[PDB]
Amino acid sequence: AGGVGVSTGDFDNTTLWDFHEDGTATITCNSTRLVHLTRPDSLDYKIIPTQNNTAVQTVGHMMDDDNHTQVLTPWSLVDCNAWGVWLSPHDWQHIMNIGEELELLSLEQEVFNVTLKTATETGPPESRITMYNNDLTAVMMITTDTNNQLPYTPAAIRSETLGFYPWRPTVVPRWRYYFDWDRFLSVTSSSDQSTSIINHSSTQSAIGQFFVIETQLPIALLRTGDSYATGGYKFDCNKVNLGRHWQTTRSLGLPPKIEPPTSESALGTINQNARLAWRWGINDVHETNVVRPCTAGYNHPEWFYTHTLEGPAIDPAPPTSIPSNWGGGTPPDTRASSHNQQRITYNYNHGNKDENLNNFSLNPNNIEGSIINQGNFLSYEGNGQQINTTAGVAKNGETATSDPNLVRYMPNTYGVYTAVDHQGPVYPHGQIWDKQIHTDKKPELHCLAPFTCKNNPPGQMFVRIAPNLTDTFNATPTFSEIITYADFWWKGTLKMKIKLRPPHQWNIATVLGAAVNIGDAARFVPNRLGQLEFPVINGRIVPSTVY
Amino acid sequence: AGGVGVSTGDFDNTTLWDFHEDGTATITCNSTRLVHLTRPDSLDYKIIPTQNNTAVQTVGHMMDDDNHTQVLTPWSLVDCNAWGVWLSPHDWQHIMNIGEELELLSLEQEVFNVTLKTATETGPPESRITMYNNDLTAVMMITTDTNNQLPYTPAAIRSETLGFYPWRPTVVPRWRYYFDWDRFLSVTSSSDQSTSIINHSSTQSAIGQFFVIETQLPIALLRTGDSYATGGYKFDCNKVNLGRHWQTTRSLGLPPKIEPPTSESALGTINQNARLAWRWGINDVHETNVVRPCTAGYNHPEWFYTHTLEGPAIDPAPPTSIPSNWGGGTPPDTRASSHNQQRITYNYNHGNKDENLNNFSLNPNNIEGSIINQGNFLSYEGNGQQINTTAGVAKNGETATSDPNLVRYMPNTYGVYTAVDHQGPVYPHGQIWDKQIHTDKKPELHCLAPFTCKNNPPGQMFVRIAPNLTDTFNATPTFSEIITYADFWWKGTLKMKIKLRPPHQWNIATVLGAAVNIGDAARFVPNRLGQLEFPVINGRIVPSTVY
Amino acid sequence: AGGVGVSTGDFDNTTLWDFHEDGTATITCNSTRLVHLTRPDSLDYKIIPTQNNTAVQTVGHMMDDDNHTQVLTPWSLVDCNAWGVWLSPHDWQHIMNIGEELELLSLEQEVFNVTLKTATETGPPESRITMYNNDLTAVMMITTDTNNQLPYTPAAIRSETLGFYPWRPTVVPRWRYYFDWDRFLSVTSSSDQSTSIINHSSTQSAIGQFFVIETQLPIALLRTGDSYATGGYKFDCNKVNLGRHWQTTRSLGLPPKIEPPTSESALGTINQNARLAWRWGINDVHETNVVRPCTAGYNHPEWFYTHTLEGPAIDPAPPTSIPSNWGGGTPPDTRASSHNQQRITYNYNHGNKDENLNNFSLNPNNIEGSIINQGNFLSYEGNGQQINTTAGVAKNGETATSDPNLVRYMPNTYGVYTAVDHQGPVYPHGQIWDKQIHTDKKPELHCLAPFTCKNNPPGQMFVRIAPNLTDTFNATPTFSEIITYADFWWKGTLKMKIKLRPPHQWNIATVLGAAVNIGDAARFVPNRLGQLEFPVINGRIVPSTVY
């Protein structure tokens, strides 16, 4: 509640830890940034189809298809769904190291200190200078979508979120959403000809839904002395496990009875006739046969692109760990990308060191569901006889080297016994929460965000600069204006609950330290010139038993 | 409560709409028909095996196998589970147009005005005439199965339901159920020989269960003045979504940052280095790569017949939309039936125009889970390099044209990220509700009925004519009788709740109108001669956002 | 209640639907726009006569007479009486599709965020630049006319209403009213000479009434922090029927007794001696003779221009449907405009696609009162004898081809038995309400607006910019000023009640859909370049029985 020269709101980027008697803590992490808003290019909405030329015009690249249809709005999106907005590299270490599981509690946010200004270039065409002046009666438009009537676009994907540096100002993107279209692109190989390609794209204007912010939801017109607050929100969603499960399918159970070695250089051995009980098939009991409570993880066709009614698209399995340094004894033959891995491309605003673009490919440390793909093999019989993959009188199976398509590349072993893990949070760039799709069958996991809202997610927040007109305006498709921009302050608070992990074991545990695992430590702190980069860190570190 | 000349019950086929303050309505739709019952052929039960000759005796047709074992009862089934029993073409339009979701509430039914009669042919063998007389002390037998001890046979499949014309009388079928058998039929191609076929069918009389209506459940003997009522029933089941989701996997999310076109004939373009954040694999961010909340729909082996311990049978995926008119730019190569489609064969009683048989193949308008099958392709690496399908030093994947069996015909991409939709109600012929199978793992959807009873479904209802004997009866396997038939009135009431869809968008929505979409409008209304046909209409029409 | 940097009021363009237990709903549709006001040209009032030259100076065109007298005020009119201000194309569809009748409830409106500014051109005459600055102590003048002392000018005619685009700013016109004059223009044909024309126009300054806003009604002087509100208003007027009556005079009643056809290609026939009862005149009973409850619609002289004491003017009958595509079998001979039709000319502000002007001629779908004019004929006797139109011993009548003037062009059949319908609402351009003329005999309908206020209508609203003076002012007829303009926000809320139509019939009804009836669907949604047009739609669509 202030005027021209009275400020609203304050800057709090701190974090807090409130411990409780029952062995849990509450983490209050609040964040505040200065945002730079700029006027839209056109007053109205646009439905514009787009495509990538090199994908449709060359035979082999159908995986490059960008062809779609979207609608631009004269509105900008204020989104903080990434981790790196809320908490620092030290906060991440501290949560992962002592944490067992965490859950979301509440979210609230507001804007204040709006301060619009105008820019006017003057002088001769040789020396042109712009002057800046507060326009005190100018208005900025702001609204939040509650009841979630608009399409839901998370901005953590595509890296549009508020910036990660607490001491720098930030930019917002312009909001947009898809509009219905039809697409078909034929499959072609490095053989044949480009005149054989058929691409079909048509925007469907009868079926599509066209939303406008103005008629959907109410808007607050706010001048310099005004502020806007959402009022508070309460999450309802699943808890997230912070421990890494080292166990695989093969490590679940009671291990067999063995004879211990007498010498330090020696191996244990399993005596024949010490092999007893349950297994799958007809064979002696071996570590491969043993009946176990469930299978961990599953095979999935990779990488397999599915052609929807609009465009090709990819069907992933959850991401899993890739063996990194196995001292020679590696999987000899591996592909460019192996276990469902994910990459991110980000820029300076999101924690790159400089104005260039940076790329990072994630390798999770989750060991459980991971499948070395070259070692799969099929056996027509369980009998435990030597495998013969040559075509003839004795053909008892096939191996991933024999028919790679059938075994290595396109198995699907999903079934009733399978159990999988979400790859967990990813810092700074990961998405915190996501709404659930509205369908008869729901998914069992989401591809990125660890949290899934059971009820409606927190509503999306939009801003724009109201038009500022000269004296000659007649209502016409095009008209002169006054160049105007706004800089406002954003503040938000996210509350989470964490339970503390008690010491579970005798030997010393592996935690998240400095100078080796993450990298050179000097690379994450400021420079002589003031430069640093945000460490890209994995969500789960301290091991735990899954069964 | 009436005698010989006092009627019981009344005719109400009307529908009602009761609106509520909270934006929902109650739909009371009740239906009444005159049913013609005829005496059974044999007094007793029969366990009769059957087969189709042309399937076992020719090499290539194993998909024609009709071979099974059933038991005939001297009882008829009164079933109204189809939509077309309850409500008119205008009621269907009105529900779909303004409706958002609907749920079932209650069901009740009764029979009245029983009126049995006898028929006796007399006269010379040249001119033979039959006379008709009320037999006032004759009895009709009626019972309903509550507690659901008998096998559950829905009659909407096989088209045995009460007729769809409000102004015509109806027929009931004779009730029957399966009895255990063993079956094996070997697979043979258009090559080789018919002496190579081996068909095995044996009814198993030790294991099978044999039910008789008389000893399972109590029966009401009712004369002309008598009536019978079930007493009312209350559904517990899932709600059904009435909107069509236009979105696919590829339309879910925030669309990319693009450069808008300057000209009306022009396309948007995605600038390099404007490509940021999350995706699957190692490549630049493209519409195919982008990480999305979930995958919509899944690949499934089609059409794949599985051989159970009795007979072959087919494993479907849910039905989805087939691209119809795409202006040339179609999927070039498509099969006789493509996306899990379903057909129905029906007759005059169920809304055909005349005494012939009619066939209709359903095409749903649900766009979401549909998969154009010819566009699938596999990539051994995510690197985004040109695809090479020729065998040699560089083989980076395969396409649906390269190995159609592996890619097009027999993929299974089901997994943790998948989400699907039920194809929704179908009018007039669709099944309204279904009981759930009693198993450790339940299904996630049912193949036809939109509603799944959590508790026991409404009990099935049976009728028969009691035997009417001449004077010479001694208890013997075969005996003379008096020819007798009954005509009774059936009445039922189904209550449903619907929530009203508020206007969600700016542009004009697509609703269900006349004269174009359905067809010629003159074809659905009576003729000079009194003839009409029931429009076959899809359940969901007004689009909505799934995410 | 705010100052320089404190905003007043908020932006709400949303619509709402509140359903009720009795089967009606309340529609709250509120609208908000940014208005650009500019300073008047002259401080004072003007009484200026005008004329069109080409009408008085050429023989044949007396229908082009523009000659009148008006008075300009230094005031602008803020009017929202058009439909297209309040609600979107989807709202229109939704009301017409499920609505039966609607009535008006209340109206309220206010202005806020006034922000005046000044413009000053500076620099050399080669490069002249204007600068813009807030003048914080400047005042805008605003008043509303309650008690309705001023002449009532609806602005929906002449297309002066606030614009139809929710996301664009708007312009207001300058208010003006008629001042008494005398006019006579002689009738002349394409024959004779222009020296025979006599035009007489004299403004009458003794009789005429001269109103000034300043002395009639009080005015509020408001600066930037000020706002103005009218306080609310309550309609009292007639209800409006939303259904289209398909029936004509000839379809009202019990149809005759006929013999049905045996064949599908065949026609029913009316047996002689099956013709019984009431009719008009002496003849057998035919569909033309039958006594009916009333006559629907009436003949009227068209097009007939009446010369008032000032100028010629036209006497319309209500507009009715024109047969469009009748497959050949059309009315062979039709005029440029046939059944009392109406056109509208509108510009970009009111929903044209671009800066050009657009024209649309309305064809109502109301079938009832429409009269095909070429088929009228007169019979001197009712006897049913063959009509003879040749002059001689047997002349029993005349036909529209025989004497078109007497029969086709100048009949008036209005009388005691006649019944007519208003053509209903028209979107976006139609007028919502109108005040009733103050006379001994009132009209039975109004030409455009569906609603007629019984009490006083809502008062008209006026704005102007107060004069902003330089330092040299002495009171003189002409003086220097400071160039000043204002941009204010307008907000209003209109409440309506609608009753919901229950399903009335068996066959599928015709509703308002997309892609065919209205036109190309892509034409009503934004473009690649952001362009769209407002569909011009008719008020009544779902048929209903008038009797």
- How many interface pairs between A and B have CB atoms less than 8 angstroms apart? 379
> Residues 213..272 of C with a Cβ closer than 8 Å to B: which?
260-261, 263-264, 266, 268
Report how far apart, in Å, the C-alpha atoms of A241 and of each of A100, A363, C306 are. Answer: 6, 18, 88
Report how far apart, in Å, the C-alpha atoms of C316 and of each of A298, C153, C313, C341 are. Answer: 79, 20, 10, 9
Chain centroid, CA A498 distance in Å: 22
Cα C46–Cα C49–Cα C52 angle in degrees, nearest 5: 140
Give me the DSSP letters along B349-398: GGT-SSSS-EEEE------SS-B-GGG-EEES-SS-PPP--SSSS---EE
C chain contacts of residue A46, beta-carbon cutoff 8 Å: 526-530
| Neighbours, chain A (3 or more CB pairs < 8 A) | B, C
Two tokens, residue C253: 């009643």
Q: Where are the alpha helices (DSSP H) in A209-271?
A: 213-216
Q: Which is nearest to B319 in space by CA: C221, A440, C308?
A: A440
CB distance from C115 to chain A under 8 Å?
A: yes
Q: Are B197 and B184 in contact (CB under 8 A)?
A: no
Question: Could A475 and C355 be called an inter-chain contact, meaning their C-beta atoms sit closer than 8 Å?
Answer: no
As a whole number of angstroms, the distance between CA A272 and CA B396 comes to 45
Other beta carbons within 10 angstroms of residue A176's beta carbon come to: 22
For residue B56, the SS3 value is helix
- Burial of B278 from C-beta contacts in 10 A (0-12 / 13-18 / 19+): buried
Two tokens, residue A451: 């949290």
- Burial of C467 from C-beta contacts in 10 A (0-12 / 13-18 / 19+): middle
A chain contacts of residue C349, beta-carbon cutoff 8 Å: 475
B chain contacts of residue A157, beta-carbon cutoff 8 Å: 253-254, 277-278, 290-292
**Among C507, C533, C537, the residue to mutate for chain B (most B Cβ within 10 A):** C507
As a whole number of angstroms, the distance between CA B263 and CA B171 comes to 66
Cα A526–Cα A530–Cα A536 angle in degrees, nearest 5: 45
Q: Which is nearest to A37 in space by CA: A184, A223, A170?
A: A170
For residue B523, the SS3 value is helix
B chain contacts of residue C264, beta-carbon cutoff 8 Å: 527-529
Question: Could A176 and B254 be called an inter-chain contact, meaning their C-beta atoms sit closer than 8 Å?
Answer: yes
CB distance from C520 to chain B under 8 Å?
A: no
Question: Could A156 and B278 be called an inter-chain contact, meaning their C-beta atoms sit closer than 8 Å?
Answer: yes
Question: Could B374 and A307 be called an inter-chain contact, meaning their C-beta atoms sit closer than 8 Å?
Answer: yes
Resolution stated for this PDB structure, in Å: 2.9
Two tokens, residue B481: 């009788």
Q: What is the CA radius of gyration of chain A?
A: 29
Peptide bond before residue C173 is cis, with ω within 30 degrees of 0: no
Question: What is the residue type of C317?
Answer: A
CB distance from C57 to chain A under 8 Å?
A: no
Q: Are B79 and B107 in contact (CB under 8 A)?
A: no
CB distance from B376 to chain A under 8 Å?
A: yes
Helices (H) and strands (E) in chain A, counts: 4, 32
As a whole number of angstroms, the distance between CA B57 and CA C22 comes to 67
As a whole number of angstroms, the distance between CA A497 and CA A29 comes to 11
Question: What is the residue type of C244?
Answer: R
As a whole number of angstroms, the distance between CA A53 and CA A64 comes to 9
Two tokens, residue A518: 């993450």
Q: At what angle do helices B89-98 and C89-98 cross, to 10 degrees?
A: 150
As a whole number of angstroms, the distance between CA A197 and CA A187 comes to 8
Question: What is the residue type of C403?
Answer: D
Strand partners, A514: none
Strand partners, C47: C71
For residue C55, the SS3 value is helix
Minimal C-alpha gap between B38 and chain A (Å):
43
Helices (H) and strands (E) in chain B, counts: 4, 33
- Burial of A2 from C-beta contacts in 10 A (0-12 / 13-18 / 19+): middle
As a whole number of angstroms, the distance between CA B508 and CA A208 comes to 10
Q: Are A115 and A486 in contact (CB under 8 A)?
A: yes
Chain centroid, CA C107 distance in Å: 20
Residues belonging to chain A:
547
Q: Spell out where B21-139 has E strands.
A: 24-38, 46-50, 68-78, 99-112, 116-122, 129-134
CB distance from A208 to chain C under 8 Å?
A: yes
Q: Is the dihedral of CA B508, B512, B518, B522 positive or negative?
A: negative
Q: Which helix (H) or strand (E) holds B95?
A: helix B89-98
Residues belonging to chain C:
547
Which pairs count as long-range contacts for A453-459, CB under 8 Å and 24+ apart, including other chains?
Answer: A453/A235, A453/A236, A453/A237, A454/A236, A454/A237, A455/A236, A456/A147, A456/A148, A457/A148, A457/A152, A457/A433, A458/A107, A458/A233, A458/A433, A459/A144, A459/A145, A459/A146, A459/A147, A459/A148, A459/A230
Question: Could C5 and A474 be called an inter-chain contact, meaning their C-beta atoms sit closer than 8 Å?
Answer: no
CB distance from A205 to chain C under 8 Å?
A: yes
Helices (H) and strands (E) in chain C, counts: 4, 32
Question: What is the residue type of A220?
Answer: A
**Among A209, A221, A462, the residue to mutate for chain C (most C Cβ within 10 A):** A221
As a whole number of angstroms, the distance between CA B357 and CA B169 comes to 19
Cα Dmax for chain B: 100
| Neighbours, chain C (3 or more CB pairs < 8 A) | A, B
Give C279-294 as a 3 state SS string. ECCCCCCCCCCECCCC
Peptide bond before residue B428 is cis, with ω within 30 degrees of 0: yes
Question: What is the residue type of C8?
Answer: T
Strand partners, B103: B497
Q: What is the CA radius of gyration of chain B?
A: 29
> Residues 16..35 of C with a Cβ closer than 8 Å to A: which?
34
Q: Are C50 and C70 in contact (CB under 8 A)?
A: yes
As a whole number of angstroms, the distance between CA B541 and CA B383 comes to 41
Q: Which is nearest to C33 in space by CA: C229, C181, C171?
A: C171
A chain contacts of residue C354, beta-carbon cutoff 8 Å: 477
